[PDB]
From a paper:
Among the parasite exported proteins is a family of serine/threonine kinases called the [name] (from a conserved Phe-Ile-Lys-Lys motif) kinases, which are exclusive to apicomplexan parasites. All FIKKs share a conserved C-terminal kinase domain containing the eponymous Phe-Ile-Lys-Lys (F-I-K-K) motif. All FIKKs, except for FIKK8, are predicted to be exported into the RBC. [name] showed exclusively Y phosphorylation activity.
We determined the crystal structure of the [name] kinase domain harbouring a catalytic Asp-379 mutation (D379N) to prevent autophosphorylation, which could introduce microheterogeneity adversely affecting protein crystal formation. Crystallization was facilitated by two anti-[name] nanobodies generated through llama immunization. The structural analysis of the kinase domain ATP-binding site revealed some conserved features among the FIKKs that distinguish them from most ePKs. (1) The glycine loop found in ePKs, known to position ATP for catalysis, is not present in the FIKKs. An equivalent loop exists but has a low degree of conservation among family members and is unstructured in the experimental [name] structure. However, a basic residue (K/R) is conserved throughout the FIKKs at the position of Lys-205 and could help position ATP for its catalysis. (2) The F-I-K-K motif plays a role in ATP binding, or in this case, ATPƔS. The invariant Phe-228 is stacked upon the adenine in the back of the nucleotide-binding pocket. The bulky and hydrophobic nature of the Phe side-chain reduces the size of the back-pocket with the equivalent residues in ePKs often having small side chains such as Ala, or in rare instances Val54.
Author numbering:
A (entry chain C): 4 to 128
B (entry chain E): 3 to 127
C (entry chain A): 157 to 194, 204 to 216, 223 to 286, 302 to 343, 349 to 561
The structure:
């Protein structure tokens, strides 16, 4: 993989967690980057994403207030700050990278996005 | 995440019709462009047909254009290849397929993601 | 008002040609410039002469690649096409635009051989190659500003203001318009190939290695016509894959699905002009389509679909399942009605065939608020 995650773990219902996803090589400089999530049984669903410029970002409806994503000025690395975490947020968060930005991410089928990460578990007690 | 099964081949006479079917078992059908290719014992592979995800666009090798037609039903998970005005040169094993791709460069070739077992079609003189 | 012709292209270039030995700029001899570097069979470099602290741009091309490309362009009277870089074209395109249409490309200063007509050149270069004496052809231009990609990165540590976006999209359409008018296509529009200045958003086009003439007096590539007509290309691999137009993809698939591995070779001996039709697109409409993608890319802050091929892109197929209409499209519905309308007239083929660039430059949206 060229997407390499970190920051997963267990948190109390209410507390916070924050995930990195770095991408080595100045190849994804034009690609957008973001986060999906998967729970046992559930299909992988969109969480958040940010433009190549790191200037524009959008969120799923269900996290629209709690989570915010950001992107380093120099390295192709993104950060998903998660607050007010609920039991319904327990899932494996998958970092993704693509040339398309926007709600195309809700429509493109899974195997279509340019690049995927391996995953990191988040559990919420 | 898809396995394919052909059916509905046989040996016909010249000018005869035949309608190949193909059951798609696995992931959602909507999420893969389909195709049909043929393999005649003597020669190398012949790409015969490709159809888009929903069915809008379809393309054909000039050796079957306006004799054969590729269609699909996404509620019943099937691809068809209606083959009419059959000729001897259409004797071959025909293979249902999934996820055709190529590069804009002409030197490349048509790679499928999946292909079922195949069905024989022989055609009298 | 002279438009791009291959006779003129060559004549333009010969005026700019010299041995690198004998070239001075300001007082500084060529040999004594410190060239800083900027896959690619060509190498680009920056440099800074001190008399006038003047910053130049240098493209260098192996004469082996030159000599081959010139023989072909001569065979096809300027109508040679490849998926990769046509250096002979870029040279003439640049020389011509400089002499007759300042202000589209950065200023062009010289073409140089480094260790009467372009044939006399090739003669020499060929004798040199026959003695394993390699060298380069050097294209020396003004260094102008910084590309759009860079511009955006720098400014943006929001994206760029809609106000700003609009100024860039406008000047770009101006450039294409003036380029087309001069008699040339681009066929590699993308943020990296458009330069911008600090001085009042003043822009230029860059590259011209994928360029074609826009007019021809030959039918496809064979029969001599009595008057000019639009130019058609059989090379669907143009610019970056993201900007490739749908009709070019249709051609790609046509070659693939009939097992045609070398177009240039296959067509060489096809006279029946009914066949030929199937492997050709209009170049000028292709340009327009690219500019369309550029617009969407600049507005969206990134592509929406990744290639314009419904076989290989579910998103594109939805674009089409709504007749390439940004207003009826799901991913652009809540964009400015007027902008969507503007873009539609660079994308859909009926519009591309009909709607002129001069008329799009006066489109209602260029005068709305914000
Ligand atoms: N005269 C110029 N002034 C400033 N920047 C330039 C100039 N010419 C080219 N560039 C930039 O330098 C890089 C390489 O130049 P070009 O080869 O002309 O363009 P290009 O389309 O990037 O082509 P290649 O073939 O990929 S190097 C690009 O980022 C251009 O934007």
């Amino acid at each position: 993989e060229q997407l390499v995650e970190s920051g997963g773990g267990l948190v109390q219902a209410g507390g916070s967690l924050t995930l990195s996803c770095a991408s080595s090589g100045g190849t994804f400089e034009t690609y957008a980057m973001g986060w999906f999530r998967q729970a046992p049984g559930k299909e992988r669903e969109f969480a958040a994403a940010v433009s190549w410029s790191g200037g524009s970002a959008h969120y799923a409806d269900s996290v629209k207030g709690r989570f915010t994503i950001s992107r380093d000025k120099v390295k192709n690395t993104v950060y998903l700050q998660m607050n007010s975490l609920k039991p319904e947020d327990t899932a494996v968060y998958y970092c993704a990278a693509d040339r398309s930005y926007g709600s195309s991410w809700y429509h493109y089928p899974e195997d279509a996005l340019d690049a995927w990460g391996q995953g990191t578990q988040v559990t919420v007690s | 995440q898809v396995q394919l099964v052909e059916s509905g081949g046989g040996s016909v006479q010249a000018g005869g019709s035949l309608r190949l079917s193909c059951a798609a078992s696995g992931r959602t059908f909507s999420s893969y462009s389909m195709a049909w290719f043929r393999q005649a014992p003597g020669k190398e592979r012949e790409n015969v047909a490709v159809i888009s995800w929903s069915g809008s666009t379809s393309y054909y090798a000039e050796s079957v254009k306006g004799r054969f037609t590729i269609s699909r039903d996404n509620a019943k998970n099937t691809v068809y290849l209606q083959m009419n005005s059959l000729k001897p040169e259409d004797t071959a094993v025909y293979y249902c397929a999934a996820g055709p791709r190529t590069t804009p460069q002409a030197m490349g070739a048509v790679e499928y993601d999946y292909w079922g077992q195949g069905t024989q079609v022989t055609v009298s003189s | 008002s002279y438009v791009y012709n291959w006779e003129l292209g060559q004549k333009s270039l010969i005026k700019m040609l010299d041995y690198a030995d004998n070239f001075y700029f300001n007082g500084v001899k060529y040999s004594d410039w410190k060239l800083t570097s900027m896959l690619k069979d060509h190498k680009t470099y920056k440099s800074i002469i001190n008399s006038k602290k003047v910053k130049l741009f240098i493209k260098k091309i192996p004469i082996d690649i030159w000599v081959e490309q010139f023989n072909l362009m001569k065979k096809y009277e300027g109508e040679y096409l490849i998926d990769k870089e046509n250096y002979v074209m870029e040279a003439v395109s640049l020389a011509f635009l400089n002499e007759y249409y300042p202000g589209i490309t950065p200023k062009f200063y010289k073409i140089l051989y480094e260790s009467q007509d372009l044939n006399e050149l090739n003669d020499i270069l060929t004798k040199k190659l026959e003695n394993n004496i390699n060298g380069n052809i050097v294209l020396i231009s003004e260094f102008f500003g910084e590309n759009v990609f860079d511009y955006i990165k720098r400014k943006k540590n929001s994206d760029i203001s809609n106000e700003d976006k609009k100024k860039i999209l406008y000047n770009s359409l101006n450039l294409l318009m003036r380029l087309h008018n001069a008699g040339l296509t681009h066929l590699d529009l993308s943020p990296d190939n458009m330069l911008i200045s600090p001085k009042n958003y003043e822009m230029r086009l860059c590259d011209l290695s994928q360029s074609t003439p826009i007019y021809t007096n030959k039918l496809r590539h064979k029969e001599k016509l009595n008057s000019i007509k639009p130019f058609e290309s059989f090379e669907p691999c143009i610019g970056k894959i993201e900007y490739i137009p749908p009709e070019c993809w249709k051609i790609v698939w046509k070659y693939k699905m009939n097992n045609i591995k070398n177009p240039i070779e296959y067509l060489k001996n096809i006279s029946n002009q009914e066949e030929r039709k199937k492997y050709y697109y209009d170049v000028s409409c292709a340009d327009k389509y690219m500019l369309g993608i550029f617009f969407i890319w600049m507005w969206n802050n990134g592509f929406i679909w990744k290639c314009s091929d419904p076989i290989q892109d579910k998103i594109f197929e939805i674009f089409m399942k709504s007749n390439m209409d940004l207003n009826k499209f799901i991913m652009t519905k809540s964009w400015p009605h007027e902008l969507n309308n503007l873009i539609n007239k660079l994308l859909h083929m009926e519009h591309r065939k009909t709607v002129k660039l001069s008329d799009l430059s006066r489109h209602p949206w260029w005068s709305s608020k914000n």
